[model samples]
Target: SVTVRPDWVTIEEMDFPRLSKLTLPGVKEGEDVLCCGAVEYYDKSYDRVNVKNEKPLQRIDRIFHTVTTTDDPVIRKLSKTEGNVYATDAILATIMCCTRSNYSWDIVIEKIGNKLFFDKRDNTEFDLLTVNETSVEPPQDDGNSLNSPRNLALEATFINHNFSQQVLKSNEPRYKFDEPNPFISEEEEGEVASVAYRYRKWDLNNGITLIARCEHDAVMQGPNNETQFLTIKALNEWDSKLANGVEWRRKLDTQRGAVLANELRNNACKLAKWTVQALLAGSDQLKFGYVSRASVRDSSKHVILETQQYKPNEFATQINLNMDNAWGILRCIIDICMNQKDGKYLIMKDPNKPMIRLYDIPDNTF
Candidate 1:
């Protein structure tokens, strides 16, 4: 007698014979209870609604209601809990079809000796039945269960708070550059300029220093007239006399140099995209530039740039630069420019030409 309407399905006419067998002395008609049973039938016909040809008898495995109503119902398809109650096909179909209506019910049927009794409860616990399964049980109240809507909401809030705290902590200033102003002095004239940003930790340990120089004459009349050439030089300061020093600083320089060298030889497209993007931000034009010279200093103060040199044509390619690779390279530069300190580093939306620039504010500026 179930009615399947266009918008919803009505289950008022459905009968629960096995559910009616259980007896409860103090149970009320409107009170809720838990029901667990195996799916005996599944109607696959699109137009079929009534249970005309369905079997007359169905089995109810087990049912019980704990005193605590706080436990949420866990529902899953083709999965069963520890008990013997199976979430039959009939129960799932009824619930899925009537989900839009104000329909709610729970059945608690227990057997004592030869007699069966029924009780009503507020929430129903169901476990889905799978093929080739012998038994099913209602979901347990384990703390790890994410079945409850309340639990899901609580977990979501916890994750959001944790993420927010991590972001806030990382954004705090934790290091400073040794030189107040690291950019080269305007008085020095040439296509080359020296810059350094020293990183200092609060602890007494000596911090790492990054020394670099920009040489513009490395490439003359690049594919773009305004191309800016770049070369990196890594150093560690052991003795004040040596330009680039040793150990950890030397190791880092070698790693960075290898990355640059590989890109210049095998990944020219990536290098060209990065160069154009660094010089011109938000421009659609495909531009080309050169990386002619790079230097890494050894422990003895020997310059490594003498060993690595690239011809202008060796770094040239006709591939179009995409914005993602362009921005990615900028991010890499910012990583070096900011000394691994977390904060806003790149300003790409500037109104003036050369829209991108590093945020090199002093620690006190915060």
Candidate 2:
């Protein structure tokens, strides 16, 4: 359990329930459940064109067809000088129709005279091709496979069908909300007023885990129940700052180096002890926490448990102008449940706890 601090700053101890509520929200009560997943990268292949004594041109060229009912017909041609392939860029574009959804697939490719701009839904048009809502069909090349001549055809189909298919699939609710905080697109009029940002990277199998219990009957019944376990009210803005090692040395120099150094060393020990306690308590309850790196093993038959430790004073100094800054950083992280400016409370569920516990919140302020 963690306690709160006076002046609305710092934590007396660690609290699992409060932290869960702040990060996940509605652990105690709510009806809708949201799951989140992140896409880190988008995949695309580029064509590399090189000519004698010239910079090469890179183009994204691909295409395919789709289903639709309406028909509009148009044709166009484009030309380029021979041998100067490096200096030329052109594409031919066209829209194709499919019968399944009455949705048109559009396409364009520079090599095809660069005329058409395809909509990104046609590639996966196979998914929607069925009369009933059946599984999606894999795309067929129809002469649009990476070869020349069909460059325009492939580009047009790929962009219109594939891109659109992915978007539609992604819009499904199951794949949407796995993050600790709900991701709300920023708008001019509505903005979250206050938020505490949590930044952490730990091994998935180990590191740290949160334990949450629901105060409501629905969640306590089990995951199959209709009640929501966690809901993200809003996400905080996050950015990384390079750790400043030089600045740390300068601060140490200003003090009687030895005394300040000793104090920091002692504090470091204390933090380490506290971290150990947190880990022990969590592990006893089957919640994972950070462990030395040398302890883990790789599939290649290598033992790879690793350890990382941050000096509290140094971390504080890097983020703060003085001791106060350091203290503030510590305060923001110690408590999990907090009020955002919009007056919405952010909460998280204890991933380990089978039931919710109110006392997990600290009483440092009292």
Give Cα-based local distance difference scores for all models.
0.23, 0.20
Q: What lDDT score goes with residue 14 in model 2?
A: 32
Model 1's alpha-carbon lDDT is 0.23
lDDT of 2 by residue, 36-92 (tens): 222211111111111111111122222222221111011111112111001100000
Can you tell me which runs of candidate 2 are displaced by over 4 Å?
1-177, 183-366
- For candidate 1, write residues 208-270 as lDDT tens digits: 111111111111123455533322211111121121112222332346455344333333322
Indicate which candidate wins on TM-score.
1
lDDT of 2 at 97: 7
| Candidate that would win on lDDT | 1
Instruction: Estimate the Cα RMSD of every predicted model relative to the unseen true structure.
Output: 36.2, 28.9
